[PDB]
């Protein structure tokens, strides 16, 4: 029960060896296209037939993808979230996939007075809010302007515009000075620690488009991103129901949530 210091374990390779909650996030389009109010009890009974305890399957609703990405909710044991593919919302889809599929340990920021820099590809700048407009101006070693007049907040270059969520990266090894109206939006300096297997994302419509890591060298279409076709939302609900066990087999309980990591990083 020594929680803190990692201790090596020992096992065997020949000896024979070897409840929770389920949430679901769905868009308002399905609600407008179902036309049945008591559907929640129907789904609960079906999941009971599948084996899950009744009265323990929660539901959440959101207006749009961009608005849902505003302060997302990890409060669940198995996130299974559906997303409607749009031919013009690709960047928000990618940033949402990045934000709710990896465990991001962040730090506070205050750009009005201080400098900032980055040291690794795990270092990223994440801003969340209702209206975020990022302005970026790199500086030289002697704190002099490079393509921007430091004394003015206009000659900069905008890396984001009219978005609720944004993920930005700059070249490691140089300092930067940031400008944005923090009244309706906040920003954090975050480091990507490890992959969180507590969430699953299933895509409907379109093709494979997601990219979970900013590295161009890899676009890993791992096995926590699925794709199905659809013309009636009831078909999608039934198909999801029929293979809940497979989704459970794919994922597992949140490792950080277990008492084992009570002193590394709580959940």
């Amino acid at each position: 029960q020594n929680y803190g210091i990692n201790l090596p374990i020992t096992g065997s390779m020949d000896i024979a060896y070897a409840t929770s909650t389920l949430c679901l996030y769905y868009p308002t389009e399905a609600a407008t296209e179902i036309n049945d109010n008591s559907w929640k009890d129907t789904l609960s009974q079906l999941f009971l037939t599948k084996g899950w305890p009744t009265g323990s399957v929660y539901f959440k609703e959101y207006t749009n993808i961009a608005s849902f990405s505003v302060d997302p909710q990890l409060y669940c044991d198995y996130n299974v979230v559906l997303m409607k593919y749009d031919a013009t919302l690709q960047l928000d889809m990618s940033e949402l996939a990045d934000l709710i599929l990896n465990e991001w340990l962040c730090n506070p920021m205050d750009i009005t007075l201080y400098y900032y820099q980055q040291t690794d590809e795990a270092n990223k700048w994440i801003s969340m809010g209702s209206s975020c407009t990022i302005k970026v101006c790199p500086l030289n070693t002697q704190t002099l302007g490079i393509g921007c007049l430091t004394t003015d907040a206009t000659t900069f270059e905008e890396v984001a515009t009219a978005e609720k969520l944004v993920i930005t990266d700059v070249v490691d090894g140089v300092n930067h000075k940031l400008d944005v109206t923090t009244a309706t939006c906040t920003i954090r300096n975050c480091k990507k620690l490890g992959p969180r297997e507590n969430v699953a994302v299933i895509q409907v419509g379109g093709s494979d488009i997601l990219d979970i890591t900013a590295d161009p060298t890899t676009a890993p279409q791992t096995e926590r991103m699925m794709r199905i076709n659809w013309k009636k939302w009831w078909q999608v609900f039934y198909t999801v129901v029929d293979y809940v066990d497979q989704i459970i087999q794919v994922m597992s309980k949140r490792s950080r949530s277990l008492n084992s990591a009570a002193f590394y990083y709580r959940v």
Partner: protein, 692 residues
């Protein structure tokens, strides 16, 4: 030993027949309802039951024929009577010879405004009518009671026929046809058999409706009433026909230390008596057909519903009890209306009510379905006299169905009821107030059971009581729990095997062994495997020594039943039936003959060895078949492989080996204690095979 649970399971199974008989008595009428307009779908019958003279029922077409029904009371000779057919008055000739049974007559108009006739002679004491519409023809009851037929006509617009009645009718599907005649030709069915007991608004969709115990001990103040139905017969009011009891409704309010509780109650009576006061045969005299009075062999039921934190947890009941206090009911005067002379007056009549049972019930008011509590009440006769003056009816006891209201608009009953409800509590908080994968889970759970305790349990035989005494049950379903499992078990594979063996044995009273017998009926391997498969049935012959395979199967079934929680009471029979057959397909048996042992396996193994030094012996099928017919048989928990490995690798003594060939529990458990890897391997291999 522990195998006895199997032997009893097929033994008392015959009792299910008795229960099944009761089940067929319990195997349902929809109604009655208010006289309204609707479209009763096809494949549905119309069971009408009027009591008041008038136009009974008519089906409107507006394009096809007109159907009219007229009911005629007895004691009326050849005269002319006026009715209101389709809103237009019409006279009809009536001539009746029967004196206690009413008669129905069908009136047919060839079109909307055609000619008028009277036909369709029907005579019945319960006064019941049956009309059906199916497969391009209309059915109506025709023929004298009790056994009759259905008149058939073929007129257009069948599915659009909407028949407006003026009485109480029941709608029944086709499958209950055997019920329908039994419920038409055999008197008025009891009111408790109905689904919607109260004649209130009609609905075509009525449905009869890890944990933690919750106890509710509250108090009730029931206020209930009675209801009379009175009809006047033909003539000029000189004689009546029926003065009967009918269901009633009462909704009121009261106080329960702050709350204005709304209590909804409905009343009914069953098994009443019908005193007959038969007057003179002259057409003009005071004659009463039936006088319904309540006596000791009759009961009154009350259905009670009210909103409360107790009543919102009644859907699942663990225990239920009643401690009511008896209440007296006394009747009042009921004066008849005889146009000439002095009318008779009923006086007296008093009874008492006591509680002798309680269960769940169904009740509806407008469209709201309820899960009500039905309290059964027994009755007692009392001191006050009950007589009918102006006549010769005197010295009778009971309570007449004329005026039991006695002015008071409610009868008070105060008592306390205690019930225990089961509520789904996934944890020790968030307790609600208002109201497949099991195969995989069972197969996965079967890897962690201990061995010594398993053997200990297999030593102690079970019975019909210990099997279900460790599992929680609902009192409503615990009534039929042994019955259902035995009914499903009498149709099991083992049942077919034992029936076939008995049939073959009996047929034999008209191969591979020495002669013809009911057990001698890689070729050697196949024949031995068939012999072993047939010999598997010997475990129901009580001709074994020591422990047997079925004991282990029963023990593991009990353990996994106790540990598991994802099984409903409706699921136990299937699990038991599948487990009693599929468990342990790899069985082995050995028999002993003059210091020699022959063993055969279902999978196709066969060996022979001596008891002194375990020397391999060549196999002789003939002597095996000769001896296994009538000789002791012992389940080969320790087969030859384990025995030889033990005799080689471990220095056992002669007593241990001889008991092992007999599978003595004491030495086997001693080996278990020593934790010998070979015995552990054998036991674990046997246990792992126990799965669906």
């Amino acid at each position: 030993m522990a195998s006895l649970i199997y032997r009893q399971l097929l033994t008392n199974s015959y009792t299910v027949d008795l229960s099944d008989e009761i089940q067929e008595i319990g195997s349902l009428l929809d109604g009655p309802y208010q006289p309204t307009t609707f479209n009763p779908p096809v494949d549905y019958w119309m069971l009408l039951a009027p009591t008041t003279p008038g136009v009974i029922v008519e089906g409107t077409n507006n394009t096809d024929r007109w159907l009219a029904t007229i009911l005629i009371e007895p004691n009326v000779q050849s005269e002319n009577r006026t009715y209101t057919i389709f809103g237009i008055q019409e006279q009809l000739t009536v001539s009746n010879t029967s004196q206690d049974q009413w008669k129905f007559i069908d009136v047919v108009k060839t079109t909307a405004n055609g000619s008028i006739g009277q036909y369709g002679p029907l005579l019945s004491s319960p006064k019941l009518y049956a009309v059906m519409k199916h497969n391009e023809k209309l059915y109506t009851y025709e023929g004298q009671t009790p056994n009759a037929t259905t008149a058939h006509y073929s007129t257009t617009n069948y599915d659009s026929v909407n028949m407006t009645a003026f009485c109480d009718f029941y709608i029944i599907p086709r499958s209950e046809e055997s019920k329908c005649t039994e419920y038409i030709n055999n008197g008025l069915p009891p009111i408790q058999n109905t689904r919607n007991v109260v004649p209130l608004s009609l609905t075509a969709r009525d449905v009869i409706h890890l944990w933690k115990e919750m106890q509710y001990n509250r108090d009730i103040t029931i206020r209930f009433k009675f209801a009379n139905t009175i009809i006047k017969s033909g003539g000029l009011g000189y004689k009546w026909s029926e003065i009967s009891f009918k269901p009633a409704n009462y909704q009121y309010t009261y106080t329960r230390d702050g709350e204005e509780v709304t209590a909804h109650t409905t009343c009914s009576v069953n098994g009443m008596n019908d005193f007959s006061f038969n007057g003179g045969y002259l057409p003009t005299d005071f004659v009463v057909s039936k006088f319904e009075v309540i006596k000791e062999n009759s009961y009154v039921y009350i259905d009670y519903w009210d909103d409360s934190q107790a009543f919102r947890n009644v859907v699942y009941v663990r225990s239920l009890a009643a401690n009511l206090n008896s209440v007296m009911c006394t009747g009042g005067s009921y004066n008849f209306s005889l146009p000439v002379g002095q009318w008779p007056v009923l006086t007296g009549g008093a009874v008492s009510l006591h509680s002798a049972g309680v269960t769940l019930s169904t009740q509806f008011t407008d469209f709201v379905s309820l899960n009500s509590l039905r309290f059964r009440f027994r009755l007692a006769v009392e001191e006050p006299h009950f007589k009918l003056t102006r006549t010769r009816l005197d010295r009778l006891y009971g309570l007449p169905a004329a005026d039991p209201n006695n002015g008071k608009e409610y009868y008070e009953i105060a008592g306390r009821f205690s019930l225990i409800s089961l509520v789904p509590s996934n944890d020790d908080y968030q307790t609600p107030i208002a109201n497949g994968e099991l195969r995989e889970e069972f197969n996965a759970l079967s890897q962690e059971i201990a061995m010594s305790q398993l053997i200990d349990l297999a030593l102690l035989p079970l019975d019909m009581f210990s099997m279900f005494s460790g599992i929680k049950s609902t009192i409503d379903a615990a009534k039929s729990m042994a019955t259902n499992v035995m009914k499903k078990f009498k149709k099991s594979g083992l049942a077919n095997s034992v029936s076939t063996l008995t049939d073959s044995l009996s047929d034999a009273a008209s191969s591979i062994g020495s002669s013809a017998s009911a057990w001698t009926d890689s070729s050697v391997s196949t024949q031995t495997s068939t012999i072993s498969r047939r010999l598997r049935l010997k475990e129901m012959a009580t001709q074994t020594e020591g422990m047997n395979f079925d004991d282990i199967s029963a023990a593991v079934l009990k353990t996994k039943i106790d540990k598991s929680t994802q099984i409903s009471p409706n699921t136990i029979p299937d699990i038991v039936t599948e487990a009693s057959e599929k468990f342990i397909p790899n069985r082995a048996y050995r028999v002993i003959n003059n210091d020699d042992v022959f063993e055969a396996g279902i999978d196709g193994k066969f060996f022979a060895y001596k008891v002194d030094t375990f020397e391999e012996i060549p196999f002789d099928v003939q002597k095996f078949a000769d001896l296994v017919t009538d000789s002791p048989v012992i389940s080969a928990i320790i087969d030859f492989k384990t025995l030889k490995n033990l005799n080689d690798n471990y220095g056992i003594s002669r007593q241990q080996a001889f008991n092992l060939l007999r599978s003595d529990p004491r030495v086997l458990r001693e080996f278990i204690n020593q934790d010998n890897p070979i015995i552990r391997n054998r036991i674990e291999q046997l246990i792992m095979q126990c799965r669906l």
